[PDB]
Design a protein around this ligand. Structure first.
Ligand SMILES: [Zn+2]
Ligand SMILES: [Zn+2]
Lengths: 158, 116, 107, 196, 98, 160
């Protein structure tokens, strides 16, 4: 046998047994009869589809929005580039004697610290930030925690 | 030849022999249901077959406008109206005998005078 | 509403507070299966209706062999008031009606 | 209307008149092999052999047609339920991603969306597919029994003339598909490359 | 030929709904052994059901086409011998007046 | 049927070897003794909500099984006449009550004649022999292989 089958329980109940099958058909002797026939006839005489609409405006005016037009697009849909541009900021060099102290506190919080997160937390240029980061920490590329900066064993083993 | 079907699962039965009574039994191959055969015939392969000579005869055959008419006498109701057609078997060995269908009694007779 | 399968651990006792067995109590109830025309079905299958009002009356001859249902005057004189119930199968066999409800999920 | 692709279904009567066993096998798209008709019927939800013949032959006394159907049921006897019939179809399918359990679902989808598409492609229409399949088998047996001549390919009633309308419709359908594909490719490029 | 014309095709669904309302039994409840005289109804090569009195259906269908309710291009064939009723609505069929 | 009967949705995989409701009770009784990154860009094809909802609900078809496993029926959804039916229930006063229909399910019996398995089914049809024996099922039944759930449950229950 198989241990697991993944059933889906539901509350069910038999609430009757069918005894007769019926086909309701309007009586041909009813005074209102032949109105259904007209309704049935109208079913085949109805065309839901609508014909294409042809523009009656001047061709030159219609094409004014096509091609190398002078109009500046006002659409904001899927403007990925615009969104990123607005959010921009840069700090200035935030001298050494303070940053070198801050990293160790950041390292103490967690022993494996990413580059992207570190730039987010420290807000430094990557250029200057690399100098201090390499002086204090090292990166293990070939290990399971690849591309992750970690404090050097000399300072971690304290 | 008549095909038989099982009662418990609707599967078709197959012949079997019972040496205890030397009889013919039709037994199902899945649910072990048996039933004595009413006839000893189990197979037939008619190399020359006449099945399909009048295939397609319906209650409203006379309503077909493409069928030809004839004035031959119906030897079951004595009527002159009828629609006739050739054999419906497409094997290129059948005779050109005509089959007549009466429009008053739905009786089918043939013009054959050799064997009938 | 996913749930365990064989449930050899007996988890249904607390997960659900209702019996999980099919209720074969109301099965002994005569039911007629009726196929309706498009015009009549379009107004009898609406869920914004069926307030328990009178939809008509079923008329059966004393000797049988002929049935007919007559609607009330609520149709607005737009459809026939008399219909013939054609029994496509006098003896209907092995057809049943079963419901479906959600189970209480706590305790 | 809807996809404009064409799928061909062939029901083939193997063996000659001098053979002791002539079976019928049908070719299904994306299956790579010819399957006996009985197995296909079971895959559609018709397990009983009697029900299988009922869809094929519409006459009880037409024993001659039933006799020719005897080998077909004999070949497809080792399969006697829907689940195993679907798995047999699935194993022959050329996907090789389905491992052992998606095979049943994969086979079910093929029989639903790619098998006889001109009837329907929505779930819950296995009965219609089976009845048409029996109709195809019934027609094949009728010709095989010298009761109906093979269909004439020169019959003008079975031919269609494609005018500028249908010809342009297919061209526009193909070109529009390319345009739609190009549009999305721009969206993917625009989203990933951070472009307006 | 001079009088030859080629159809443009129309929607077959209106014809299918008409057949259902006039006694075209759905194929889901078709038992061949309980009715070995029914006529198979085909619309654009699709078997949609069976119908017990093919004469009345054909007369009603022909009358509707002639007066104009059904598009004249729709082709209707009743094979009495084969017990089949075929209705064609697709485009590309060649027809001529008579 | 052997009461009680359960009608729920379950996956139709290895139904032949599935445990019978009575057996789980027997096994449950045994328990008492023991105690004491992505591509970041993908295309989704628009699909009508009705079909997707129908597909999700109908993934696991209805299965009706009795206590002893003597009856096992699997329901298949039907769409031809699902929404064109109306039910009239006869109350115990002579009157009739109308209830619209929702769906139609066709139930087919499962595991009544010791169905084989796919692995063995392919082997037999393959060129293992000229043709499968006419009474192969009878021969294998005596060997004991290829049993049924009802036969599977009775022996285990009797063994206790
Ligand atoms: Zn049997
Ligand atoms: Zn006569």
């Amino acid at each position: 046998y198989i241990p697991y089958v993944k059933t889906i329980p539901k509350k069910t109940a038999i609430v009757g047994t069918v005894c007769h099958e019926c086909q309701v058909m309007p009586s041909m002797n009813d005074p209102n009869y032949h109105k259904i026939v007209e309704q049935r006839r109208n079913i085949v005489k109805l065309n839901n589809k609508e014909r294409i609409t042809t523009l009656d405006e001047t061709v030159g005016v219609t094409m004014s929005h096509t091609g190398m037009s002078m109009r500046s697009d006002n659409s904001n849909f899927l403007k990925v580039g615009r969104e990123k541009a607005k959010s921009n900021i840069k700090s200035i060099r935030m001298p050494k004697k303070e940053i070198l102290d801050y990293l160790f506190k950041l390292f103490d919080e967690y022993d494996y610290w990413s580059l992207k997160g570190l730039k987010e937390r420290t807000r430094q240029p990557e250029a200057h930030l690399k100098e201090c980061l390499d002086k204090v920490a090292t990166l293990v590329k070939k290990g399971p925690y690849a591309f992750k900066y970690t404090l050097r064993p000399e300072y971690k083993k304290l | 030849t008549t095909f038989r079907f099982c009662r418990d699962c609707n599967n078709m039965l197959y012949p079997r022999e019972d040496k205890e009574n030397n009889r013919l039994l039709f037994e199902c191959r899945t649910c072990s249901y048996v039933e004595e055969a009413g006839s000893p015939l189990v197979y037939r392969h008619e190399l020359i077959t006449n099945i399909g000579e009048t295939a397609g005869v319906v209650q409203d055959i006379g309503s077909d406008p493409t069928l030809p008419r004839s004035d031959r006498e119906c030897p079951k109701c004595h009527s002159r109206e009828n629609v006739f057609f050739q054999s419906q078997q497409r094997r290129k060995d059948t005779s050109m005998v005509l089959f007549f269908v009466c429009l008053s009694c739905s009786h089918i007779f043939t013009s054959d005078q050799k064997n009938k | 509403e996913v749930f365990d399968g064989n449930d050899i651990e007996n988890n249904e006792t607390k997960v659900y507070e209702e019996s999980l067995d099919l209720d074969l109590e109301r099965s002994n109830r005569q039911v007629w299966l009726v196929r309706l025309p498009m015009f009549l079905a379009e107004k009898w299958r609406d869920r914004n209706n069926l307030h328990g009002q009178e939809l008509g009356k079923i008329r059966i001859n004393k000797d049988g062999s002929k049935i007919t249902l007559l609607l009330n005057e609520n149709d607005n004189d737009s459809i026939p008031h008399e219909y013939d119930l054609e029994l496509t199968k006098k003896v209907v066999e092995n057809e049943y009606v079963f419901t479906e409800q959600n189970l209480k999920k706590y305790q | 209307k809807g996809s404009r692709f064409i799928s061909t279904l062939q029901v083939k009567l193997y063996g000659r008149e001098g053979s002791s066993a002539r079976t019928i096998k049908a070719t299904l798209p994306y299956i790579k092999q010819d399957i006996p008709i009985v197995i296909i019927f079971r895959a559609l939800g018709i397990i009983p052999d009697g029900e299988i013949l009922e869809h094929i032959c519409y006459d009880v006394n037409d024993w001659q047609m039933l006799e020719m159907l005897k080998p077909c049921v004999e070949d497809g006897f080792v399969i006697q339920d829907r689940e195993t019939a679907l798995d047999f179809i699935g194993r022959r399918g050329t996907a090789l991603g389905i491992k052992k359990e998606k095979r049943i679902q994969y086979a079910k989808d093929i029989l639903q969306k790619e098998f006889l598409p001109h009837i329907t492609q929505l779930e819950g229409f296995e009965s219609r597919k089976a009845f048409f399949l029996g109709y195809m088998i019934n027609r094949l047996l009728l010709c095989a029994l010298d009761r109906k001549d093979q269909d004439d390919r020169d019959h003008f009633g079975k031919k269609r003339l494609d005018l500028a309308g249908p010809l342009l419709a297919q061209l526009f359908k193909t070109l529009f598909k390319k345009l739609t594909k190009d549009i999305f490719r721009y969206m993917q490029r625009t989203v990933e490359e951070a472009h307006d | 030929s001079l009088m030859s014309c080629i159809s443009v095709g129309t929607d077959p669904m209106p014809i299918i709904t008409f057949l259902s309302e006039w006694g075209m039994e759905p194929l889901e409840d078709y038992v061949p052994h309980q009715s070995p005289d029914a006529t198979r109804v085909f619309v654009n090569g699709v078997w949609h059901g069976v119908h017990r009195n093919p004469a009345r259906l054909m007369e009603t269908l022909r009358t509707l086409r002639r007066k104009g309710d059904i598009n004249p291009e729709v082709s209707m064939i009743r094979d009495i011998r084969e017990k089949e009723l075929k209705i064609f609505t697709d485009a590309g069929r060649v027809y001529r007046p008579l | 049927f052997h009461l009680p009967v359960r009608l729920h949705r379950k996956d139709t995989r290895n139904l032949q070897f599935q445990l019978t409701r009575a057996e789980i009770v027997q096994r449950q009784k045994e328990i008492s003794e023991y105690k004491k990154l992505r591509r970041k860009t993908r295309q989704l094809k628009v699909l009508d909500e009705n079909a997707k909802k129908l597909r999700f609900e109908e993934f696991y078809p209805w299965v009706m099984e009795d206590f002893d496993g003597y009856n096992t029926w699997v329901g298949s959804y039907e769409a031809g006449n699902s929404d064109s039916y109306v039910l009239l229930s006869v109350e115990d006063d002579g009157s009739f009550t109308m209830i619209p229909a929702d769906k139609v399910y066709k139930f087919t019996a499962r595991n009544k004649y010791a169905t084989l398995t796919i692995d063995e089914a392919e082997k037999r049809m393959d060129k293992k022999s000229g043709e499968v024996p006419r009474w192969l099922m009878k021969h294998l039944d005596n060997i004991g292989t290829t049993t049924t759930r009802y036969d599977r449950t009775r022996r285990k229950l009797k063994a206790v």
